[PDB]
Amino acid sequence: SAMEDFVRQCFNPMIVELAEKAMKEYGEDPKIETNKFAAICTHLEVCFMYSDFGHRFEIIEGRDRIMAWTVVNSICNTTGVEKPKFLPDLYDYKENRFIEIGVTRREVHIYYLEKANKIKSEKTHIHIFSFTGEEMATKADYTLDEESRARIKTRLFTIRQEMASRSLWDSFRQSERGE
Ligand SMILES: Cc1nc(-c2[nH]c(Br)cc(=O)c2O)no1
Ligand SMILES: [Mn+2]
Ligand SMILES: [Mn+2]
DSSP states (O other): OHHHHHHHHHSOHHHHHHHHHHHHTTTOOTTTSHHHHHHHHHHHHHHHHHHHTOOOEEEOTTSOHHHHHHHHHHHHHHHOOOOOSSOOSEEETTTTEEEEEEEESSOHHHHHHHHHHHSOOTTSEEEEEETTSOEEEGGGOOOSOHHHHHHHHHHHHHHHHHHHHTTOHHHHHTOOTTO
């Protein structure tokens, strides 16, 4: 499958290795579930960019369940913020809130509604990015400055265009794996 080669060519080896772990540890083959592989890579990269564009952010995503829950519990004990039922992706120290990052191939409002209905906890802030350069955040609070969100949007659009240049974007968009 060309999707695997595209993933290995456009994503950092660290991100690819983390995605391979998240998949093979839980019984999934990145050679079979290629769309999910690409989606996990993209989501991890977006989370890491979000965090780097802050210090201000503590990355929960990219860790094993043990370490992620350890970090969440430590943040809850220090700041007193309520413990999320589902592992969020980041913690904002400035705004003092957990953040769930979503990357979708569908409309941002549909994915935002799905995410909100999933995590029935208003305190976890939701930020949805799309591959067409659109975003949607809880209360329209995008947390980051314009430049950081622009960089993330450019990266996402570039991933989509690279997929399209290899005739991979149609299969990826018509699939909902990873969201
Ligand atoms: C636990 C745990 N779940 C996730 C997760 N799963 C999917 Br599917 C889409 C996401 O955006 C996301 O953050 N990360 O940690
Ligand atoms: Mn997550
Ligand atoms: Mn997420």
